[PDB]
Write a protein that binds this ligand. Structure first.
Ligand SMILES: *[C@@H]1O[C@H](CO)[C@@H](O[C@@H]2O[C@H](CO)[C@@H](O[C@@H]3O[C@H](CO)[C@@H](O)[C@H](O)[C@@H]3O)[C@H](O)[C@H]2NC(C)=O)[C@H](O)[C@H]1NC(C)=O
Ligand SMILES: *[C@@H]1O[C@H](CO)[C@@H](O)[C@H](O)[C@H]1NC(C)=O
Ligand SMILES: *[C@@H]1O[C@H](CO)[C@@H](O)[C@H](O)[C@H]1NC(C)=O
Ligand SMILES: *[C@@H]1O[C@H](CO)[C@@H](O)[C@H](O)[C@H]1NC(C)=O
Ligand SMILES: *[C@@H]1O[C@H](CO)[C@@H](O)[C@H](O)[C@H]1NC(C)=O
Ligand SMILES: *[C@@H]1O[C@H](CO)[C@@H](O)[C@H](O)[C@H]1NC(C)=O
Ligand SMILES: *[C@@H]1O[C@H](CO)[C@@H](O)[C@H](O)[C@H]1NC(C)=O
Lengths: 170, 109, 53, 170, 170
């Protein structure tokens, strides 16, 4: 394969987390997931999931009610009530599961983009937006610079002047 | 000079829907979920013609008031129709014990 | 002489839809009665006539 | 009018679908909706709408319950139950209709933007982001190139060199 | 402090509204909230809040039901019904409050970004995207130009030629 990600697809070879980086260096290549965004995404989901169980109270149950022959009016009201409540709850659970699976799926693809942007505005001109979710460095950098990008530091002046010449190769 | 543009659809529709933040928002397309169409006619549910008691009551009907003449193939129905205030109930007066209960027994017939 | 699937005390319904505002008392396969006046879901989008049209 | 779209408004003259293109060529002008995004948007909505009816089960109805003079306690519990369930359902329907009309309206204006971007990253420097939802081609192209943009191919090297000179006209 | 906003944080010194501008001029500095976006955001929230109370009908209450010694079957159905409805309503309110607080919080951070973009596409090359939510003017402008940016006019040709030279200072 030609590697790349985000707009292309998912990385089978990454394990550390949900969101990460690839990097192509002279000091090897690989994958390294950003655990800061992954944790601040895990926290969210954990609290989305737990907030569903913590609100839906585990309740003591008592159901079994018995009516005689000349009481089928009440037997049918008990039936009306028993089925009526199962009806509401089956709807309520079934809807929230579909509606929030939708919200979890958008949450991620937003977190991914919100990270693709973190880097774009961090590097600028010093790299081209080569085909989908990747950047082609206009200056060639050390693993120290890679981990500078990953932890948000980078330091734009160091490589700005270097890139200025390599960018002009048109 | 040559150009290219990206744009959404628009037509002559007056369909106004509502949201959480906005209300009476006119839209291109929309689908309704509420029904208000009643034909004012009692039809045969399933294909089984229902029991049209008439001026009679449930009591009247089953006890066999001399006016309630439907003791025929009116053994098979889909549902039972009663006139709100039915004039032909119990001819000789009295009390129909647990009347209401029997109505449910007949409801399931 | 009609044949219905849904019968009310003030008429009959075409139970394709999921909600009803006609009458709570019914027999047969009927769409659940609600009090609501208007239930319209948007399929399309906000109808905006640009520039001059 | 001055044509343009997206940020300006809606196209009365487009029919093929919800999302589309205009194009200004030497080989005429018009409208042509992108049915690939329109179908992958119709599918969504169809499944949003159908998922509302498919969950809300069409139920057999039985309501009519009768109580005597010395039974008004039960008559009022039947009333409590009958009204109580209509109450929940009227809220439940009324809320989902307002909440998901909101979600359908955001879904579209996202799909539109997600297409305006598809083209921006496909062309790059070979066109300027002229006033709202439009691009002004820096090289002048054949209807074949137009339909290359529409079906995502385009081919950036062919016109890159051409545009390089026309862009310099400052 | 170094001022700046949006991606950095909130402005304690702004009062006029929720969304606004700072500006650094030769004719002083300060804050001025954009009341057009703030009103078209207040309207939304007012209608989100009011749409919650306007649907949830203020209802006449009647609860107190009394049963004898040989009636504890009905007493328990009344209890089943009373608790059952409080159960649904406590869930229904508690969920909508959590779910729409989420939607209000995303609504804002979208409105903010949708304004940061309004300006980016209005100025273009005539300013650099200096560190988070700010622009550094490539031409130096009058309070008249500032209020031209704020009310969307700006007028790109006036300062385009000016900036063209100052941008070249590399
Ligand atoms: C079946 O239904 C018919 C029609 O509702 C019943 O007929 C009506 O019966 C009432 C008594 O229940 C009659 O009222 C009488 O009116 C005169 C008025 O001068 C008054 O003097 C009497 O004291 C009494 O109130 C009424 O005339 C009679 N006829 C009609 C056509 O309404 C009938 O009794 C019912 N029969 C059975 C077997 O259920
Ligand atoms: C990022 O990592 C480098 C490693 O040398 C370190 O110097 C820098 O302080 C780190 N930045 C932050 C914000 O932690
Ligand atoms: C617009 O107007 C005509 C009436 O002249 C109407 O029949 C037609 O369906 C409308 N167009 C659309 C696209 O709905
Ligand atoms: C706006 O909504 C109100 C609700 O009271 C209604 O009376 C009115 O007819 C609606 N108008 C339009 C144009 O949809
Ligand atoms: C039913 O009652 C009405 C009362 O006005 C009467 O006109 C009609 O003839 C009655 N029909 C029968 C069959 O008793
Ligand atoms: C796009 O259309 C052109 C028409 O010549 C065709 O050659 C090309 O293969 C198409 N691309 C795709 C991805 O279908
Ligand atoms: C913006 O303000 C300036 C102030 O001189 C005014 O000339 C211009 O017409 C205003 N624009 C709009 C769209 O209101």
């Amino acid at each position: 394969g030609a590697i790349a990600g985000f707009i292309e697809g998912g990385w089978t070879g990454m394990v550390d987390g949900w969101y990460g980086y690839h990097h192509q260096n002279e000091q090897g290549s690989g994958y390294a997931a950003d655990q800061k965004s992954t944790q601040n995404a895990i926290n969210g989901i954990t609290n989305k999931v737990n907030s569903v169980i913590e609100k839906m109270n585990t309740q003591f149950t008592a159901v079994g009610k018995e009516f005689n022959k000349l009481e089928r009016r009440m037997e049918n009201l008990n039936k009306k009530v028993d089925d009526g409540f199962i009806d509401i709850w089956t709807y309520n659970a079934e809807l929230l599961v579909l509606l929030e699976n939708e919200r979890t799926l958008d949450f991620h693809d937003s977190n991914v983009k919100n990270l693709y942007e973190k880097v774009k505005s961090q590097l600028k001109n010093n790299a081209k937006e080569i085909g989908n979710g990747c950047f082609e460095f206009y200056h060639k950098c050390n693993d120290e610079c890679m981990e500078s990008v990953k932890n948000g530091t980078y330091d734009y002046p160091k490589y700005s002047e270097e890139s200025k010449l390599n960018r002009e190769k048109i | 000079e040559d150009t290219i543009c990206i744009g959404y659809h628009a037509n002559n529709s007056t369909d106004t829907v509502d949201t959480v933040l906005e209300k009476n928002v006119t839209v291109t397309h929309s689908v309704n979920l509420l029904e208000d169409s009643h034909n004012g006619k009692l039809c045969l549910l399933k294909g089984i013609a229902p029991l049209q008691l008439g001026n009679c009551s449930v009591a009247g009907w089953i006890l066999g008031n001399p006016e309630c003449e439907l003791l025929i193939s009116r053994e098979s129905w889909s549902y039972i129709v009663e006139k709100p205030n039915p004039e032909n109930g119990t001819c000789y007066p009295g009390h129909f014990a647990d009347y209401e209960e029997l109505r449910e027994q007949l409801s399931s017939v | 002489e009609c044949d219905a699937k849904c019968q009310t005390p003030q008429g009959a319904i075409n139970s394709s839809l999921p909600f009803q505002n006609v009458h709570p008392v019914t027999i047969g396969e009927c769409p659940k009665y609600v009090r609501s006046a208007k239930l319209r879901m948007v399929t399309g989008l906000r109808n905006i006539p640009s520039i001059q049209s």
